[PDB]
Design an enzyme around this catalytic site. Structure first.
Site, short mmCIF file in Angstrom:
data_model
loop_
_atom_site.label_atom_id
_atom_site.label_comp_id
_atom_site.label_asym_id
_atom_site.label_seq_id
_atom_site.Cartn_x
_atom_site.Cartn_y
_atom_site.Cartn_z
N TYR A 194 22.55 -16.56 -21.99
CA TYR A 194 21.77 -17.02 -20.85
C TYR A 194 21.83 -18.54 -20.70
CZ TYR A 194 18.06 -17.28 -17.38
OH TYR A 194 17.34 -17.52 -16.23
N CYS A 196 -5.10 0.55 -0.39
CA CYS A 196 -5.92 -0.61 -0.03
C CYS A 196 -7.39 -0.24 0.20
CB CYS A 196 -5.35 -1.33 1.19
SG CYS A 196 -5.17 -0.30 2.66
N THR A 198 24.27 27.49 -13.44
CA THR A 198 22.95 28.09 -13.59
C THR A 198 21.96 27.44 -12.62
OG1 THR A 198 23.32 28.59 -15.94
CG2 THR A 198 21.03 28.57 -15.16
N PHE A 222 14.78 31.49 -15.74
CA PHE A 222 15.60 31.14 -16.90
C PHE A 222 14.73 31.13 -18.15
CE2 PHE A 222 18.08 28.24 -19.64
CZ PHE A 222 19.32 28.85 -19.56
N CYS A 276 -7.85 2.04 3.45
CA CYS A 276 -7.65 3.48 3.25
C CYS A 276 -8.74 4.07 2.35
CB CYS A 276 -6.28 3.76 2.63
SG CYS A 276 -4.84 3.22 3.61
N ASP A 334 16.26 -11.82 -15.27
CA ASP A 334 16.49 -12.98 -16.12
C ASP A 334 15.30 -13.27 -17.03
OD1 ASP A 334 19.01 -13.25 -15.12
OD2 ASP A 334 18.74 -15.27 -14.31
N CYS A 364 0.81 -1.22 0.00
CA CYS A 364 0.00 0.00 0.00
C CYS A 364 0.85 1.27 0.00
CB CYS A 364 -0.98 0.02 1.18
SG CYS A 364 -2.14 1.43 1.18
ZN LIG Z 1 -3.58 1.29 3.04
#
Ligand SMILES: [Zn+2]
Ligand SMILES: [Mg+2]
Ligand SMILES: [Zn+2]
EC number: 5.6.2.-
Length: 1102
Positions: free
Chosen positions: A850, A28, A107, A74, A31, A667, A10
């Site tokens: 690999y 979640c 700058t 700027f 909340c 991988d 979360c």
């Molecule tokens: Zn939460």
């Protein structure tokens, strides 16, 4: 969305949230019960549950404020470097400015100090020269508003302003202070007692000149001298120092180091402010390398008429340098010299008077210490490959030359005792000049041995690179295009140089014929004029995530690691390329794994479907125990020194706020995909720019082409991984407990495959004794031995039938995981797990492709690698490109760079490359040879099928006798046998025994079988085999054969007598097949989960 839950996912409460909600970006259900809210911040505000999302909302707020501010003060907006910089500055992180000159460092310092002063915080700007103090002050006073208080100090200061500065600084009331380094070095204690909120350093070299300045700045940001002395003591000790969490520091910013940051003082930054003062090393190069077959000056002039302005010549020695100098000065071109007027003609060429500048290998690779302007040099000409030469006589041969010889000969093994006189003595005694040159040319590989001039030539790759780089650099945010032409007549030197260039810079060289000149010139001038135009910024910040530190280590080499930020539990390195900034960090293993807390062992059921519950891993560094549970102390050793992965997660989420686009580079298999999703799911609610790349090679080509094929997280792979994991958990736990009922030991059953394999070995221990049949060996006169049935007593062999044929012999297919793990663990006395470790090591270091592959496919790239090696070796005519198998995910295990093991050993002896041990080199030699054999032409032979008569029993036997034409036998040895006639032979000595028809198992045999019988997959083999040894179910012997112990036999016997339906091969292969069908999206996920649950439900009730 894979129907799963993650323990610490979360974004707002840090607690437990589901997969899909994090996939979208929502917290979640605790909340936020709202499924499609207008705004997360507002909806969480209205529920009074806004806990941590506030940080992100105000982050984007304050950042966008900064951006608007800079865009107003700027001219234009923040650049790709200033974006990462700004996103770092609103968090309060101290770091190093990694960028070229002219992209707005000073700058950005000014504007940052101005913004922070506008907020109310006071800052300081330290500069090397007082002129920069005056200039920066000038630019500030005419851009700052009246509410800001700016003060400065310099040598030639105004009479009243100089004391006005002192009076101002004494008040402790300022907003922006601008002064020199001299001021800091002089006013140490005066600056130590003040406290700032921001410090900018336009030149770190001047500050790092003294040690007291470091302590000064650290005392300026908000750190006491006692903590400083403590950390100093700790870094003097040798170990790192934990920054006190209760410390609220300021902000320190330093420009890139030009020199080397030696000292113990710089590490204080690494341990207190979490950053290293990395020096700007840019490997950003866009150079086209072309080689000409000869030193033909006509071709030289022909090219000079095409290149015109922007040429640089590198001659061998100053003699021939003066020779070419005279040559072209007499042909009336704009001549130049750097051995007489190294300063005049330099600036002459710089302006536009001289068109071509000629120099020497060492006279210009060392005497351009001034500025070295790369905006004028567009083409670099090498008149002879930059190389070193050594005489080989009685003396004049250096230490290593005699060393490599005698070491393999037999005198210097005595702890490597170095003595030149001794070398000379041994040379006199044992070797003649002829034999000496022979042995040297025999041992030394990868270099050039000239027996004619008695010279050993070593192509200075470093020199060639540093010289070539003067035609390509990042100018005004744009990487110009370079051209490097080599004039080398000897193919050996060019080949050696090409290999060791392909090794370091990862750049290639093309022949003259395969190169379009006018096109390349046009591209160079185009890059120039494109760099000249007004820079509309294009630079971007980029984040790459890998799962192992080794990968990042080997990425840093060909990326150009300059600085290294330490973020919480991890360390992220930053590198400067042409396209912008690239960030790469290591995760060090997995992040999430199933918890044994609740549910069906680990998975909770709801609404019919199955929902896995995961959690962050913690590995202890003391004992090494891994657990998913949220413990503070280790459940094994009770020590706090653990490695929480939720720290890694939080760190990664903090870092993801800095980068523009983030790529995950794990991988290419299912494990890496599961990990990639475990990370992207966590980072998704933060930054909505996450993609997946699959690197098969850890090189420039591998990385680039992996990026060209960028995709999103394929869910089939993840689902397959989850299925296999859940199966392992359920079956493993069930059979474990069922074994706890009978024997008592806690952890026993590891899974199904383990049970099947142990069964194979156990039954093998029985079917090995019964397969014992009598046999006798028969050494035949002027022929070869012959093994036949038990008891013969006729003492003669009568050839009945004889026929010869001319077959063409095809080589063995390239190394897959099965082939490698078998034949390498066979030819070497090594275990399968060890060989797997070596394979992974070779892969992550970027030498092989690999390793976890089960296909023999070879792209035109690898074929070209083979053909290029053969081209170097002189035998390119025996080359045959074979795709071997069209269908297949990963390429077979093959070397990525055309370099043999001997050449590698040479490169290591020289001091170019590796931390490679001997076994690494040997395994690489194995793969290299098997592959090249699998890419060489067929062997024309002549074999005979002879049916002989021994003791009234007809017996056929086929053998190869002669090799008509040699092909792949140059790498893998093809044995030849003495010819056979149509007559009778005498038996010399009969040797009676009874070697078993079905021999016992070896590790390579086990791998061979579970590959043959279709049990498991490349990412499991060595693991499964090692599990038996680790559990104590199996042992090795004299012949290193796999034998089951009492315990293992008891276990498998019990399992066989009770639960056979869950262990039987016919079910294992079935399950593996089905899961591999899930891997492609041809079988349902939740359904197979239901099946597993069903058979588990059946098994549990016994
Ligand atoms: Zn939460
Ligand atoms: Mg500057
Ligand atoms: Zn522990």
């Amino acid at each position: 969305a894979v129907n799963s839950k993650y323990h610490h996912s979360c974004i707002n409460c840090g607690g437990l949230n589901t997969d899909e909600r994090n996939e979208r970006g929502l917290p979640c259900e605790v909340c936020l019960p709202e499924d499609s809210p207008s705004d997360i911040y507002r909806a969480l505000l209205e529920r009074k549950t806004l806990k941590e999302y506030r940080f992100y909302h105000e982050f984007w707020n304050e950042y966008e404020d900064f951006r608007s501010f800079f865009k107003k003060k700027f001219g234009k907006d923040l650049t790709g470097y200033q974006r990462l910089w700004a996103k770092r500055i609103v968090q309060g992180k101290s770091f190093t400015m990694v960028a070229p000159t002219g992209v707005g460092k000073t700058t950005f310092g000014m504007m940052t100090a101005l913004w922070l002063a506008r907020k109310g915080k006071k800052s300081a700007l330290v500069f090397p020269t007082v002129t920069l103090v005056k200039q920066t002050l000038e630019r500030l006073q005419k851009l700052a508003d009246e509410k800001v208080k700016i003060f400065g100090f310099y040598s030639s200061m105004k009479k009243e302003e100089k004391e006005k500065f002192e009076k101002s600084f004494e008040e402790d009331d300022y907003h922006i202070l601008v002064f020199s380094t001299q001021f800091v070095s002089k006013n140490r204690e005066k600056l130590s007692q003040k406290r700032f909120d921001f410090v900018f350093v336009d030149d770190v070299d001047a500050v790092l000149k003294a040690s007291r300045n470091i302590d000064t700045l650290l005392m300026m940001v908000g750190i006491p001298e006692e903590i400083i002395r403590k950390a100093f003591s700790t870094i003097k000790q040798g170990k790192i120092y934990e920054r006190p969490k209760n410390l609220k520091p300021g902000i320190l910013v330093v420009s890139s180091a030009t020199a080397k940051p030696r000292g113990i003082r710089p590490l204080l930054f690494r341990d207190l402010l979490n950053f290293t003062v990395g020096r700007l090393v840019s490997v950003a190069r866009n150079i086209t390398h072309v080689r000409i077959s000869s030193r033909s000056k006509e071709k030289l002039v022909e090219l000079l008429e095409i290149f015109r302005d922007g040429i640089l010549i590198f001659a061998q020695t100053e003699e021939e340098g003066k020779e070419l100098y005279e040559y072209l000065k007499r042909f009336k071109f704009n001549v130049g010299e750097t051995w007489s007027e190294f300063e005049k003609n330099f600036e002459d060429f710089k302006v536009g008077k001289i068109n071509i500048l000629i120099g020497v290998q060492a006279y210009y690779g060392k005497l351009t210490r001034g500025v070295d302007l790369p905006e004028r040099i567009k083409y670099v000409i090498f008149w002879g490959t930059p190389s070193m030469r050594f005489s080989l006589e009685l003396d004049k041969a250096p230490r290593f030359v005699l060393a490599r010889v005698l070491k393999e000969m037999g005198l210097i093994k005595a702890q490597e005792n170095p003595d030149v006189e001794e070398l000379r003595k041994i040379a006199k005694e044992h070797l003649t000049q002829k034999e000496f040159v022979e042995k040297v040319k025999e041992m030394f590989r990868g270099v050039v041995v000239k027996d004619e001039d008695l010279e050993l030539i070593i192509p200075d790759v470093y020199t060639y690179i540093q010289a070539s780089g003067r035609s390509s650099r990042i100018l005004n945010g744009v990487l110009v295009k370079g051209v490097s032409v080599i004039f080398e007549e000897d193919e050996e030197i060019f080949e050696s140089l090409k290999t060791r260039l392909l090794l370091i810079a990862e750049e290639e060289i093309i022949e003259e014929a395969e190169a379009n000149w006018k096109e390349l010139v046009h591209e160079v001038e185009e890059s120039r004029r494109r760099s000249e135009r007004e820079l509309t910024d294009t630079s971007r910040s980029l984040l790459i995530i890998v799962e192992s530190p080794t990968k990042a280590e080997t990425l840093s080499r060909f990326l150009g690691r300059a600085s290294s930020r330490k973020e919480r539990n991890i360390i992220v390195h930053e590198a400067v390329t042409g396209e912008g900034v690239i960030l790469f960090t290591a995760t060090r293993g997995h992040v999430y794994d199933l918890v044994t807390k609740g549910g069906i062992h680990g998975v909770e059921e709801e609404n019919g479907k199955f929902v896995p519950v995961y959690n962050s891993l913690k590995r202890c560094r003391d004992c090494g125990y891994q657990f998913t549970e949220d413990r503070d102390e280790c459940p094994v050793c009770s020590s706090k020194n653990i490695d929480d992965k939720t720290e890694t997660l939080r760190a990664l989420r903090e870092i993801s706020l800095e980068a523009d686009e983030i790529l995950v580079a794990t991988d290419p298999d299912v494990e890496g995909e599961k990990i990639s999703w475990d990370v992207t799911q966590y980072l998704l609610p933060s930054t909505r720019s996450l993609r997946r790349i699959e690197m098969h090679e850890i090189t420039r080509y591998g990385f680039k082409k992996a990026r060209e094929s960028v995709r999103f997280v394929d869910f089939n792979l993840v689902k397959a991984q989850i299925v296999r994991r859940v199966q392992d958990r359920w079956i493993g736990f069930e059979l474990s407990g069922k074994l706890q009922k009978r024997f008592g030991r806690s952890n026993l059953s590891a899974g199904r495959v383990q049970s099947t394999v142990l069964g194979w070995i156990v039954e093998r221990e029985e079917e090995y004794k019964k397969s014992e049949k009598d046999f006798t060996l028969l050494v035949l006169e002027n022929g070869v031995n012959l093994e036949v049935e038990g008891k013969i007593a006729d003492d003669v062999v009568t050839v009945v039938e004889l026929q010869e044929a001319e077959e063409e012999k095809n080589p063995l297919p390239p190394y897959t995981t099965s082939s490698a793990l078998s034949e390498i663990s066979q030819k070497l006395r090594l275990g399968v797990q060890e060989v797997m470790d070596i394979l992974q090591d070779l892969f992550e270091k970027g030498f092989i492709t690999y390793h976890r592959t089960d296909s023999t496919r070879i792209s035109l790239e690898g074929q070209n690698v083979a053909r290029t090696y053969l081209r170097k070796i002189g035998k390119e005519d025996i080359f045959m490109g074979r795709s071997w198998s069209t269908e297949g995910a990963h390429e077979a295990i093959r070397p990525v760079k055309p370099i043999d093991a001997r050449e590698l050993e040479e490169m290591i002896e020289e001091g170019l490359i590796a931390d490679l041990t001997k076994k690494h080199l040997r395994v690489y030699e194995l793969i290299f040879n098997r592959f090249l054999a699998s890419q060489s032409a067929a062997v024309k032979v002549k074999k005979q099928i002879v049916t002989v008569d021994v003791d009234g029993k007809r017996m056929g036997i086929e053998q190869i006798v002669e090799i008509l034409r040699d092909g792949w036998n140059l790498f893998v040895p093809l044995t030849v046998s003495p010819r056979f006639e149509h007559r009778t032979y005498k038996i010399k000595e009969k040797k009676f025994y009874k070697k078993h028809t079905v021999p016992l198992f070896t590790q390579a045999s086990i791998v061979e079988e579970m590959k043959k019988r279709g049990i498991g997959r490349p990412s499991t083999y060595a693991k499964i085999v090692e599990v038996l040894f680790r559990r104590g179910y199996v042992y090795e012997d004299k012949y290193k054969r796999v034998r089951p112990t009492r315990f293992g036999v008891m276990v498998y016997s019990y399992l066989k007598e009770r639960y056979e339906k869950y262990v039987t091969e016919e079910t294992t292969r079935r399950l593996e097949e089905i899961m591999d069908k899930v891997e492609r999206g041809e079988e349902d996920y939740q359904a197979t989960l239901r099946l597993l649950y069903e058979e588990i439900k059946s098994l549990m009730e016994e």
